[PDB]
Design a protein around this ligand. Structure first.
Ligand SMILES: Nc1ncnc2c1ncn2[C@@H]1O[C@H](CSCC[C@H](N)C(=O)O)[C@@H](O)[C@H]1O
Ligand SMILES: Nc1ncnc2c1ncn2[C@@H]1O[C@H](CSCC[C@H](N)C(=O)O)[C@@H](O)[C@H]1O
Ligand SMILES: Nc1ncnc2c1ncn2[C@@H]1O[C@H](CSCC[C@H](N)C(=O)O)[C@@H](O)[C@H]1O
Lengths: 244, 243, 244
């Protein structure tokens, strides 16, 4: 099994097997909430459409696709012992928030993800990345995974848009996997969660298959009441499959 | 220990021994929050006055008291195995929300109680019953429990009304047992939690005993400060107002 | 190892070994958030400035310091078995709340602190003390501890004032220890950050400061200019040293 090069909350690595079991075949996989890309990186679709609301993420991805070697050589130079400290971290974090260059931004982004508190990605109300230092053993520079993602990106387009736009690019030959921010037990609202299910209803009536993952709750069974439901163990994870 | 025909969040099943230990005796038991009825179903008072804000609940109870066999027969049909899928569950939920007939509504309500997610009873802002499909393997039709509930209902009056009005019907022959929605750690507010205690204080002075049951917290010991308190095993508390 | 005569939420008795290890040396110790006084009672500074927002508390401490025998004598009357019941508890609480007499108030206040639900000190919107009866076995009367407190108070001033005013009293020969009300898992987030900003001002004038709090994202954020140490035992605690 291939690992993602970012640490990402909701990273769906711990349950590929369950997803792969239930995820139908097609020519093209559309992921409206790509995040770290673990589904993408452990399937064999002919092509991929991959999207996210997070503009820094998509921009990193385009860079990794188109400037692989340039990027990896630059990003390795921050994974040295001199940098594992609060003083350097806040220095890098301020550079990132002030920089207007996409490439240097993306070099810093990977450092921020591997050196900051729990690999979180967060922003204050001014749009500034605002995760503090994570105080870590020795962070792993993920070279192998970066090369694996670049190689694999040659069959993908990445877009920065909301789930309703990227789900509209799906067609007769596509499959759609949705992994939205989890339901509760700013950000992503209950209206959108219900909207997501509705869009999925539209796609299955057009013979496009859709699979959604989420927690198992009263609200998730309400929204996905038209899918086939599968419960999965670890609270409980739900998989909702709309097969035409 | 006799069981309730309804699954009901709350439900005093594992507290029964302690409640009965402290619950004084008399002609008549008033329960302003009857819910599923476990205290009713497990005591031997000569008479009961039973009340709840929930009018689907109370209307069901009046039907089970007045038209028992008719009710059992029509409810049992909803439990054949053809009804145990999502399409049917949603169709029945919709049928229930559109119906204006109390008797049909009471039949459908038992289905939804026993087929819906965790046995919840919840309504959206438009007033529609909104609990989703529970996907249980084989729900139990509670036929013995229904007949038991109806035999006992013959000495009971049921009212759909808020706690102050049901608590006013108590007299010197009554005992009053309160099982309000739990204190925390359009729902039932803190103003209402304190109002309940204050109504109790009034009753114990007219010589009518009251037992109230709740979580054990800083706020509940404050509200119930003028009662004898018993702790029980989050902890439970029983507030007893003895004349 | 000396105990505080008051039961006090977030009392620092369990954490003393960690605090002494990290707490620098000097002539004076300023506590902006003294509460029950554990650090005061278990250190050896030549003098002390001790402050809190709670005016019942500071008033009490001036009375224990200045009228010791008379206080211990009268407080003692209240710890008999006739007083360990609800009816009397509620009667005293009302007396406390109605009283205009600092001495009598200080006397009821210890009784309330020890017969009260969890040793809490809380007030309603009307400013009345509102903790209910705590149904305890038999409460310890804190005799020896009172005397230790008064003896040790001879080298202390007490002020009822907010943390920014007490911290302004520190000088070159001072060391500051802050134990603010805890961060989340009433003292506002803006106040939390202000405290760290004042600590930065102080370190810059060559005055050490040490802060105690939960280990969380926010505390790491606020204390980002301090050498951090993580303490074990329940959610995990942080100690933030600002050294010259
Ligand atoms: N309205 C929206 N439209 C598209 N993406 C959104 C969105 N709101 C939040 N997101 C994104 O949805 C993602 C959810 S986390 C998904 C993780 C992914 N399955 C993996 O394997 O790593 C986040 O990246 C977040 O940025
Ligand atoms: N204002 C009110 N007056 C009378 N009954 C009420 C009421 N509010 C709620 N109820 C009813 O009180 C009952 C609660 S029964 C269970 C109580 C339990 N301690 C818990 O919180 O889970 C239900 O029947 C509910 O419908
Ligand atoms: N704005 C403020 N300024 C100073 N003190 C404050 C404050 N707000 C709250 N406090 C106080 O800060 C205290 C935190 S508890 C401190 C406990 C103490 N370290 C011990 O060993 O017992 C509380 O007593 C509370 O009254």
């Amino acid at each position: 099994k291939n690992r993602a090069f970012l640490k990402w909350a909701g990273g769906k690595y711990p349950l590929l097997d369950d997803i792969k079991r239930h995820l139908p075949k097609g020519e093209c996989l559309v992921e409206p909430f790509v995040g770290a890309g673990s589904v993408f990186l452990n399937t064999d679709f002919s092509r991929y459409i991959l999207a996210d609301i997070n503009s820094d993420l998509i921009s990193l991805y385009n860079i990794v696709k188109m400037r692989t070697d340039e990027y990896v050589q630059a990003a390795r130079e921050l994974f040295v012992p001199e940098t594992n400290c609060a003083e350097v971290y806040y220095q890098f974090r301020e550079e990132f928030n002030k920089s207007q260059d996409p490439f240097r931004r993306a070099v810093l982004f990977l450092y921020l993800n591997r050196y900051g508190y729990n690999g979180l990605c967060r922003y204050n109300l001014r749009g500034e990345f605002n995760v503090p230092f994570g105080r870590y053993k020795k962070p792993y520079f993920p070279e192998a995974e970066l090369y694996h993602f670049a190689e694999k990106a040659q069959n993908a387009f990445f877009y920065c848009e909301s789930y309703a736009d990227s789900m509209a690019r799906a067609d007769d030959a596509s499959v759609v996997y949705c992994d939205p921010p989890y339901a509760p037990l700013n950000s992503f609202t209950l209206e959108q969660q219900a909207h997501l299910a509705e869009i999925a209803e539209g796609l299955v009536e057009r013979h496009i298959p859709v699979l959604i993952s989420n927690h198992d709750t009263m609200l998730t069974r309400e929204w996905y009441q038209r899918a086939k439901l599968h419960v999965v163990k670890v609270v409980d994870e739900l998989l909702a499959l709309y097969k035409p």
